[PDB]
Design a protein around this ligand. Structure first.
Ligand SMILES: O=P(O)(O)O[C@H]1[C@H](O)[C@@H](OP(=O)(O)O)[C@H](OP(=O)(O)O)[C@@H](OP(=O)(O)O)[C@H]1O
Length: 343
């Protein structure tokens, strides 16, 4: 008695949908074009953004690859993608949890930057008055990411306290400090739960964002006067600073490492020695500045900086660290740039 529906075949449409997803995961530009051609997706940046945001059956590494691109279309897709996230009334960690669930960060410095700038601009728009600049939010986002790595990667030996995290971020708010309890909250949130990463292979940026900066006592030979001194060394932003005491704010000297190289050397008296030197200008005095006993600051007089480590192991570690510093990391450098701009 009862009539029934005419249900249409869904075989071809389902096959097309699956085909499109398969193609996307191999090549996102090709997958998207296919879906548009087969009337399964509209061609506007906002429509493509919705498609990636839902991301059904889509590889989240591939989503990140596509969103990071320089192309005019991709830039608009990214902006629309970030507009689909709701950051209002979330703290920075909570907002990053949400954002970093939607895609996996690409490996290229310029791609990471475009995506994190888009994130940071959106966070600040949805949460006015929390941060003094987009730069502050961007830099704090990476301090939170670095913290995630420090607390949760077993390869990082010395785990930061809440107080270390608070003081590390002094001055970040366009020269001023963020609220102590805000920073503490961000710290405790990360400590209590690492960033949950989709399709996690254990090699994600959020788990492997290490701090390359170093410190330690070493023995150094003088310039004109060849005397050996125990000095406290700090390596940061491709410069080597040295101090009489760990408590000094004023350095004894500053050696920019740009244009330098490092080599292991034998010394008749001191073990575990290496030397900084200019490979392009043999015999030339290395540009540096240092303080004299009377408080004057003068240029260094060194052709080489010969330095002795207490063990072969520390010699090797310092050499590796200094070499890495000189070779430079493009992303670290861009972060350094924003930090200077904040100041
Ligand atoms: O203190 P005395 O025994 O007189 O010798 C000093 C120290 O070795 C200095 O090291 P530090 O600055 O660590 O105290 C060194 O400066 P550098 O730091 O440039 O190596 C001076 O080099 P000249 O100024 O080049 O002589 C040298 O005169």
């Amino acid at each position: 008695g009862h009539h029934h529906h005419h249900h249409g075949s869904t075989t071809q449409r389902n096959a097309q949908i699956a085909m499109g997803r398969k193609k996307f995961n191999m090549d996102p530009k090709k997958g998207i074009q296919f879906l548009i051609e087969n009337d399964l997706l509209q061609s506007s940046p906002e429509d493509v953004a919705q498609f990636l945001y839902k991301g059904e059956g889509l590889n989240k590494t591939v989503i990140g690859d596509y969103l990071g691109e320089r192309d005019d279309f991709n830039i608009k897709v990214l902006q629309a993608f970030v507009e689909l996230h709701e950051f209002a009334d979330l703290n920075l960690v909570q907002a990053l949890r949400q954002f970093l669930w939607s895609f996996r960060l690409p490996g290229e410095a310029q791609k990471i930057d475009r995506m994190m700038e888009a994130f940071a601009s959106r966070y600040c728009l949805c949460n006015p008055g929390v941060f003094q600049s987009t730069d502050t939010c961007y830099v704090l986002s990476f301090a939170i990411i670095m913290l995630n790595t420090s607390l949760h990667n077993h390869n990082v030996r010395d785990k930061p306290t809440a107080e270390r995290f608070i003081t590390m971020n002094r001055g970040i708010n366009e020269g001023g400090d963020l609220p102590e309890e805000l920073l503490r909250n961000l710290y405790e949130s990360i400590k209590n739960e690492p960033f949950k990463i989709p399709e996690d292979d254990g090699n994600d940026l959020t788990h492997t964002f290490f701090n390359p900066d170093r410190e330690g006592w070493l023995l150094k030979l003088g310039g004109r006067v060849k005397t050996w001194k125990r000095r406290w060394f700090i390596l940061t932003d491709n410069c080597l600073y040295y101090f009489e005491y760990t408590t000094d704010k004023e350095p004894r000297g500053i050696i920019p490492l740009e244009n330098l190289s490092i080599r292991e050397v034998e010394d008749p008296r001191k073990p575990n020695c290496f030397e900084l030197y200019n490979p392009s200008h043999k015999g030339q005095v290395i540009k540096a500045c240092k303080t004299e006993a009377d408080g004057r600051v003068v240029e260094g007089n060194h052709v080489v900086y010969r330095i002795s480590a207490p063990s072969p192991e520390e010699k090797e570690e310092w050499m590796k660290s200094i070499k890495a510093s000189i070779s430079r990391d493009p992303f670290y450098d861009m972060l350094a740039t924003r930090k200077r701009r904040i100041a």
